[PDB]
Amino acid sequence: KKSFKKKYKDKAIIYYEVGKFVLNYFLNNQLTQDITIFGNDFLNLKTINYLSLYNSKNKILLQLMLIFGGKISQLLSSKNLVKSLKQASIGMPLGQTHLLPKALSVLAKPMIFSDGYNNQNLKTATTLLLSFIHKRYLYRKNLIVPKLLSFADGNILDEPPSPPFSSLLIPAKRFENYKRFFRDTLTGDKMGQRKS
Amino acid sequence: AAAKLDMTIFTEGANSRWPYGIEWLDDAYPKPYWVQQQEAEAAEAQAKQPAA
Amino acid sequence: RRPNGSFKEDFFGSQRDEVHEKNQVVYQLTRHAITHYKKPFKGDYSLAIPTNLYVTDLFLKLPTQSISNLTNVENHNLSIKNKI
Amino acid sequence: PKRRRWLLNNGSWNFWFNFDKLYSEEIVTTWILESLIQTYKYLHKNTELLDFVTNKFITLGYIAPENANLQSELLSTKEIILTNSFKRF
Amino acid sequence: SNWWASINRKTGIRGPDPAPAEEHTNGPARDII
Amino acid sequence: GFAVRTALGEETNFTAADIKRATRMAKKYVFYYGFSEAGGAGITTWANQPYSGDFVIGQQRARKVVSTDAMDAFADWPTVSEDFRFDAPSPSDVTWHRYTDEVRRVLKG
Amino acid sequence: PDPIPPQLRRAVSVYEAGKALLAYITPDYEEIARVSVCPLNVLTGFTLFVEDEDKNVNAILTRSELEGRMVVHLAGRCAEKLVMGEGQMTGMGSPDLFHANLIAREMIMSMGMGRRTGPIDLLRVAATSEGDPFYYHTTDMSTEQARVALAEVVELLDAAEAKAMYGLAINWRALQALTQALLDRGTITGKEVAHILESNGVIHFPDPYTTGFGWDPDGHGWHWNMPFSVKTELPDWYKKEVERYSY
Amino acid sequence: KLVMGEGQMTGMGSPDLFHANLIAREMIMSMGMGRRTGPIDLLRVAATSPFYYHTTDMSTEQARVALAEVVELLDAA
Amino acid sequence: TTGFGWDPDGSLRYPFKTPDLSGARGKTWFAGTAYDAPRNADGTFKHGWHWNMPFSVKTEL
Amino acid sequence: TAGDGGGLVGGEGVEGSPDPIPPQLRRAVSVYEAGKALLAYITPDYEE
Amino acid sequence: GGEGLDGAAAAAVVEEAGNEFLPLLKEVLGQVPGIILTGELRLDDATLAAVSRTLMGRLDVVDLIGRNTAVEAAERVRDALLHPETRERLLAMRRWVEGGPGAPEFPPSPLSPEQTAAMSPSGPLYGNLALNLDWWRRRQDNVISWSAMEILMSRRQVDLYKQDADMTEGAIAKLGPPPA
Amino acid sequence: TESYPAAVANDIIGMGSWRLKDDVDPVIEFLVARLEGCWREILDTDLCLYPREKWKEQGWDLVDSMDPHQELEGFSYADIPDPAKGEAGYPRLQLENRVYC
């Protein structure tokens, strides 16, 4: 029992890092076709800024390929268990008894062991792309018009400063009752409770 | 004549009633109750205009 | 930094200043914000210029997002922040 | 303290400003998909190399998932093996 | 001539001279450093 | 500012210092004192009364009293006690529209 | 005598029986330590699980494990609905609903397991400087992005509810035995839960990642990847103001 | 953009762009050089040290017009 | 800068004044109906996409 | 450039700053500065 | 009768509350030709009361909850009759919940005694309990709407309930059947 | 850090990244896995892959009968559904090769 579970786990783990280093080597040493080199795959903040501000779209696509090599490697090498589970056995897609063992297999997602991406890669990828979009006004320059201008949406109209600045205690006295209302009506004391 | 201004004054004349000259207002806010009462009384008054 | 404010004539009404000196301050402030951008020794580590703050937030901070489409929040997905 | 910037609730839900989220989201999504697809298309033609390198790496050694209580770079034997594997396959 | 007469903002902005598409690329590593 | 513009024939930042002042007064015309016609009479559902300067962390100068801006603040009667202060509910951004439109009418006239 | 009325005792017993039964037959789930209904005549109830230190939190969670937890969380409310009728459901199973919803929003918006959103990160758990131990960092979404994520969350949740209902329906006799034991004793241990469930023919859930499925000499219609679309209706003034800022 | 093609542009000029925008803002919301907005003061400096510099409490339909005027100034420039 | 600008069709203003479902590409999964994926001019899918890939693609309508 | 951020220098050799500043990134800077100076010259009564 | 009832409140107090559910339920069961109501199917007040109390809740709050809610619950209680396999289960659930002298020790199971073995380990359908949650889903939509009322409600529910939304009239007229 | 002998390794890989797996019988799976694992474990100091311009450039490493001209870039096994009985192309045949030196 545990033997097969560790077989699945270890196969996944090895195919991840193999595909990752294979894409690393390929892009660094064979796309260019002196000395064989291996990158270090870490993206700082200064590096994200450089890439966002000064590089084309293809440089960004290369960095992303480097990020997702390992997941794609796992994907290419996994066994879809739907066939094995519904051949060794035989409204909802598990209700269809017609069709053919071959086209009865596309009715829902494949049963891959390691599906779902890893949160660090998603953070990196979206940080890079969001820097690119929001610090680089390609094709849309009239969108700088609302920057560093706040339009005063949810709040009281004319409110004066507070003790750090003005020694007046009315806005804080009203904020306290606002917090009472929040606890009693909307949220509660903890996550999960209907109310207080 | 050049001593005039083009400053736009939004709620002027015909714009003194519910839409107030705002065009996107009836796609953002349900019509209030007092607005409905105003419209009702004005409708019936102006329908009494020919009969008066 | 050893420590202008318009919150005093808005809410407390002090106005302890001749109109002429206030007008002069306004003139010089506008001209300095608009024309001292990247001028040696007249335009420097100066918080009175908004473009210096734009550059700071462009390189240091991470991409800021727009407002949300939610309710009971302020503009972003957050609550009103503490007064003191 | 209510929200005052309602703009549209007739064919969508919008508030004042936010005239730039659809564009930014389309860009992010399309770029991530295109990168993933190019990775897939490259690896699709190099499957034997994947199999061979996996065999070698398993017999060299690796850290089991459960045995890690507390892969950024490659050791030296693994680099000899990966270079030769690109040369052969 | 008067190429600046036919400048269009919708269909795309481009000068007269043909697309100076010069570019070269090393890997991501030799580009970052 | 309007004199500089009518002499030169071109706008300046001098207007920038005028309208600021005027805007303050114009709001105090519409909201606090009730002189306008915002509602049928000039009575408005919200006003912003001043606080006393005693609340500010204040200083003292050796100057003379300002001609207009500080001698017109002799007619205000600010609020001095904190548990008797009245602030009505803020307007609704469809009412704020009409109130600030009255401010605009005053300034344009 | 009993300070508690009948129907309240019955409702809480059925709830805890459903939750314990489904936590028993689910692979890789924790161990039941105590199941009690109104202990010491205090109006309450709980199913307690054995906290283990062999767990290393740095281990990642696969998709099947998260789905199993979702099903276990919906189990008790589905037991109530199936035994006593929809009109007799209380709001007693609310924290379980909250946790199932947390799981379903993090798979779609933190782990990229939705086929229609994709590998985009929109939620981030974060620990407080130590009330709850944690909170979340969010991202302001448009209406399209948010409606496409909502469709997926709803699909996940209603699928999990159907699986919990079947898991309870094919174990009706063991469910009956467990709720009767709770009505008569009001507090049982994990050891006795196992004993009562095994003496009545409990049917475990299959585990697909422990079998062989190999072979050794020693013994049209839908497609899962159809393209989607979101339907919206913008007015004309709105299209005008978007072209003004699209340049 | 005219020489290197509109695709190969860098963020090198994003600060100067924000400077030009800022000018168009003051001319419209602080010096009353707008045509439909006229002589009224709308902006306030946010007393702080997300990051904001200007705040304004004007209605939404007036914000529409003022921003349209800033945009057409920038288009002409 | 008065008299300059852009016209509502995109022109600068100075101051005064179907895919080919022919070969194998027509045998893909739905291939012509409303349930098909967006295609390019030559009949390839939009971003280089194939029904193998683990993410769906958003149809414009 | 402060505690971290950065991304503006171009001669430090670190992963941020490339060493010779590639040529396609020098053509662009020259085009930028040339356009700015050309417009500041043909504008009546600008600074010198 | 308004001896001292102010006249203004003396008119709103003869409202004829409409408090209860059975008079509303029979007005709906009168639309099916098979049923006849007593004091082809023959049903009395005890059966209707027990079925409704199981499926809907307390039976004298029709004014607190609305009339659209009552009409929907009446539709569901109508469809829960008209075939005995569920009728008997609902009556047995009611009887176990009350708990008189005739509580049948548990309600009946929802699954036939056949399908319980059809999914037992010695059956054709056992392995089906091992697939993803992607094989268990009961809904599929390729066009996602802009409203959440249209995502988590059925079509009949939307038509009955959309008049309570906080949207304009042009918005509300865009939901449900396009018959408009 | 743990290692495994090459026999255990070639049993974890299995019919590893063949593109036509999941439609291959379990006996054929067993045989292919065993044979290729033997080649990988015994001849692992000289096992090249056959020159690619002979077989892998013409596209003979994965052959489909519904797409003989390879206009789907070699994803025909996924993009094209199975023809029904009596339709043009029935019965469909697909081949996958591997060649080493």
XYZ file of N, CA, C and O in Angstrom, chain C residues 1-83:
332
model
N 15.016 64.328 10.201
C 14.473 65.580 9.682
C 13.772 66.358 10.788
O 12.809 65.873 11.388
N 14.257 67.568 11.054
C 13.565 68.478 11.950
C 12.240 68.916 11.329
O 12.215 69.451 10.217
N 11.114 68.690 12.018
C 9.821 69.094 11.459
C 9.629 70.606 11.487
O 9.916 71.214 12.518
N 4.212 72.890 5.898
C 3.001 73.696 5.798
C 1.763 72.854 6.059
O 1.777 71.638 5.882
N 0.691 73.515 6.483
C -0.557 72.836 6.752
C -1.765 73.697 6.458
O -1.861 74.830 6.938
N -2.690 73.175 5.659
C -3.942 73.862 5.382
C -5.083 73.370 6.255
O -6.180 73.934 6.190
N -4.857 72.342 7.064
C -5.886 71.824 7.951
C -6.190 72.760 9.105
O -7.131 72.500 9.860
N -5.424 73.833 9.269
C -5.671 74.766 10.356
C -6.663 75.855 9.981
O -7.472 76.252 10.821
N -6.626 76.344 8.746
C -7.614 77.316 8.308
C -8.880 76.666 7.777
O -9.847 77.375 7.482
N -8.896 75.343 7.647
C -10.106 74.665 7.203
C -11.042 74.360 8.357
O -12.248 74.599 8.248
N -10.514 73.843 9.462
C -11.344 73.331 10.539
C -11.279 74.137 11.819
O -12.266 74.143 12.561
N -10.173 74.813 12.111
C -10.051 75.599 13.327
C -10.102 77.099 13.078
O -10.419 77.852 14.001
N -9.804 77.553 11.862
C -10.033 78.927 11.469
C -9.027 79.939 11.966
O -9.356 81.130 12.027
N -7.817 79.514 12.332
C -6.816 80.410 12.902
C -6.557 81.632 12.029
O -6.824 82.765 12.445
N -6.052 81.409 10.819
C -5.808 82.472 9.845
C -4.944 83.589 10.428
O -5.166 84.775 10.180
N -3.943 83.202 11.208
C -3.015 84.161 11.809
C -1.920 84.560 10.826
O -0.738 84.305 11.046
N -2.306 85.203 9.727
C -1.365 85.542 8.673
C -1.998 86.549 7.726
O -3.172 86.430 7.371
N -1.206 87.532 7.312
C -1.675 88.494 6.330
C -1.937 87.799 4.999
O -1.313 86.792 4.665
N -2.877 88.346 4.230
C -3.239 87.696 2.976
C -2.084 87.761 1.989
O -1.924 86.874 1.145
N -1.243 88.792 2.094
C -0.166 88.965 1.127
C 0.883 87.871 1.248
O 1.350 87.348 0.231
N 1.249 87.496 2.471
C 2.268 86.469 2.641
C 1.740 85.106 2.213
O 2.469 84.300 1.625
N 0.459 84.842 2.476
C -0.146 83.601 2.011
C -0.179 83.540 0.488
O 0.124 82.500 -0.108
N -0.547 84.646 -0.159
C -0.558 84.675 -1.615
C 0.837 84.443 -2.178
O 1.008 83.733 -3.176
N 1.851 85.045 -1.559
C 3.216 84.827 -2.020
C 3.621 83.372 -1.870
O 4.299 82.810 -2.741
N 3.230 82.747 -0.764
C 3.540 81.337 -0.571
C 2.884 80.495 -1.652
O 3.488 79.553 -2.172
N 1.648 80.823 -2.021
C 0.979 80.042 -3.057
C 1.699 80.188 -4.391
O 1.940 79.194 -5.092
N 2.039 81.423 -4.773
C 2.760 81.637 -6.024
C 4.034 80.811 -6.068
O 4.276 80.056 -7.021
N 4.862 80.944 -5.038
C 6.140 80.252 -5.060
C 5.965 78.746 -5.010
O 6.736 78.021 -5.641
N 4.949 78.253 -4.301
C 4.735 76.813 -4.229
C 4.365 76.242 -5.584
O 4.891 75.199 -5.985
N 3.448 76.892 -6.302
C 3.094 76.389 -7.625
C 4.302 76.402 -8.548
O 4.604 75.401 -9.215
N 5.015 77.528 -8.595
C 6.158 77.616 -9.493
C 7.226 76.583 -9.146
O 7.880 76.030 -10.037
N 7.388 76.274 -7.863
C 8.422 75.335 -7.446
C 8.023 73.904 -7.760
O 8.851 73.102 -8.196
N 6.759 73.560 -7.536
C 6.298 72.231 -7.908
C 6.446 71.988 -9.397
O 6.862 70.902 -9.806
N 6.148 72.985 -10.223
C 6.033 72.775 -11.658
C 7.364 72.947 -12.384
O 7.621 72.254 -13.365
N 8.249 73.836 -11.935
C 9.412 74.176 -12.744
C 10.760 73.824 -12.133
O 11.778 74.048 -12.787
N 10.814 73.304 -10.915
C 12.088 72.940 -10.316
C 12.363 71.455 -10.407
O 13.165 70.932 -9.633
N 11.713 70.763 -11.328
C 11.932 69.338 -11.499
C 13.277 69.102 -12.170
O 13.485 69.510 -13.317
N 14.194 68.462 -11.446
C 15.510 68.081 -11.957
C 16.345 69.306 -12.325
O 16.886 69.416 -13.422
N 16.453 70.230 -11.373
C 17.289 71.396 -11.541
C 18.315 71.350 -10.417
O 17.940 71.135 -9.253
N 19.601 71.533 -10.722
C 20.638 71.375 -9.697
C 20.467 72.382 -8.571
O 20.312 73.581 -8.810
N 20.459 71.877 -7.339
C 20.442 72.650 -6.100
C 19.160 73.446 -5.940
O 18.966 74.086 -4.901
N 18.275 73.424 -6.931
C 16.946 74.016 -6.872
C 16.040 72.899 -7.363
O 15.700 72.842 -8.545
N 15.657 72.006 -6.464
C 15.037 70.768 -6.886
C 15.933 69.591 -6.570
O 16.874 69.278 -7.301
N 15.619 68.932 -5.458
C 16.497 67.955 -4.823
C 15.623 67.089 -3.918
O 14.427 66.934 -4.180
N 16.214 66.528 -2.868
C 15.434 65.665 -1.990
C 14.356 66.511 -1.328
O 14.456 66.872 -0.152
N 13.314 66.824 -2.101
C 12.298 67.803 -1.745
C 10.940 67.138 -1.826
O 10.532 66.688 -2.900
N 10.237 67.082 -0.698
C 8.919 66.468 -0.675
C 7.834 67.380 -1.227
O 6.685 66.945 -1.346
N 8.164 68.622 -1.557
C 7.210 69.560 -2.125
C 6.967 69.328 -3.604
O 6.032 69.911 -4.160
N 7.783 68.508 -4.251
C 7.627 68.145 -5.654
C 6.954 66.780 -5.704
O 7.449 65.830 -5.085
N 5.832 66.634 -6.406
C 5.166 65.328 -6.441
C 5.877 64.302 -7.298
O 5.683 63.100 -7.083
N 6.694 64.722 -8.262
C 7.312 63.749 -9.153
C 8.427 62.982 -8.460
O 8.701 61.830 -8.812
N 9.051 63.574 -7.447
C 10.004 62.825 -6.642
C 9.311 61.685 -5.910
O 9.823 60.559 -5.851
N 8.121 61.951 -5.372
C 7.359 60.898 -4.715
C 6.869 59.857 -5.705
O 6.822 58.667 -5.379
N 6.492 60.279 -6.911
C 6.115 59.310 -7.932
C 7.262 58.368 -8.237
O 7.070 57.156 -8.330
N 8.462 58.909 -8.430
C 9.611 58.059 -8.722
C 9.872 57.099 -7.573
O 10.101 55.898 -7.781
N 9.837 57.608 -6.342
C 10.039 56.756 -5.178
C 9.062 55.590 -5.170
O 9.463 54.430 -5.043
N 7.769 55.872 -5.311
C 6.782 54.801 -5.286
C 6.836 53.918 -6.523
O 6.353 52.786 -6.476
N 7.395 54.408 -7.623
C 7.516 53.595 -8.823
C 8.612 52.557 -8.683
O 8.442 51.413 -9.109
N 9.740 52.920 -8.082
C 10.835 51.966 -7.983
C 10.818 51.137 -6.710
O 11.095 49.938 -6.776
N 10.502 51.725 -5.563
C 10.493 50.976 -4.315
C 9.275 50.072 -4.181
O 9.418 48.852 -4.116
N 8.079 50.644 -4.148
C 6.882 49.861 -3.908
C 6.615 48.894 -5.057
O 7.233 48.952 -6.122
N 5.679 47.992 -4.817
C 5.157 47.043 -5.784
C 3.862 47.577 -6.381
O 3.248 48.489 -5.823
N 3.431 47.049 -7.527
C 2.284 47.642 -8.228
C 1.060 47.788 -7.336
O 0.541 46.810 -6.794
N 0.609 49.029 -7.186
C -0.626 49.324 -6.482
C -1.818 49.062 -7.397
O -1.761 49.266 -8.611
N -2.910 48.610 -6.795
C -4.103 48.218 -7.525
C -5.172 49.298 -7.426
O -5.041 50.280 -6.692
N -6.245 49.096 -8.182
C -7.356 50.033 -8.214
C -8.247 49.812 -6.997
O -7.894 49.108 -6.049
N -9.418 50.432 -7.008
C -10.397 50.262 -5.950
C -11.175 48.986 -6.210
O -11.065 48.397 -7.286
N -11.953 48.544 -5.236
C -12.717 47.316 -5.359
C -14.170 47.617 -5.702
O -14.617 48.759 -5.673
N -14.917 46.564 -6.019
C -16.339 46.667 -6.310
C -17.188 46.110 -5.179
O -18.287 45.616 -5.411
N -16.704 46.207 -3.951
C -17.372 45.656 -2.786
C -18.095 46.762 -2.022
O -18.031 47.935 -2.376
N -18.799 46.381 -0.961
C -19.447 47.335 -0.077
C -19.084 47.016 1.365
O -18.662 45.905 1.683
N -19.261 48.015 2.230
C -18.848 48.040 3.632
C -17.345 48.159 3.787
O -16.836 48.003 4.894
N -16.625 48.443 2.709
C -15.193 48.672 2.744
C -14.947 50.112 2.327
O -15.865 50.829 1.943
N -13.694 50.544 2.419
C -13.429 51.967 2.234
C -13.344 52.341 0.759
O -14.252 52.970 0.215
N -12.265 51.953 0.090
C -12.223 51.929 -1.366
C -11.609 50.616 -1.811
O -12.047 50.007 -2.786
N -10.592 50.174 -1.091
C -10.000 48.873 -1.312
C -10.609 47.877 -0.344
O -11.388 48.226 0.536
N -10.224 46.625 -0.492
C -10.788 45.606 0.369
C -10.219 45.743 1.765
O -9.385 44.936 2.175
N -10.642 46.769 2.491
C -10.157 47.007 3.838
C -11.200 47.805 4.594
O -12.193 48.240 4.022
N -10.980 47.974 5.884
C -11.872 48.762 6.715
C -11.260 50.136 6.956
O -10.137 50.424 6.540
N -11.989 51.000 7.636
C -11.465 52.299 8.029
C -10.329 52.083 9.011
O -10.406 51.212 9.880
N -9.269 52.871 8.889
C -8.095 52.601 9.698
C -8.072 53.486 10.932
O -8.682 54.554 10.974
N -7.349 53.014 11.944
C -7.420 53.593 13.274
C -7.135 55.081 13.241
O -6.290 55.563 12.486
N -7.851 55.810 14.084
C -7.785 57.259 14.088
C -6.546 57.770 14.801
O -6.031 58.835 14.458
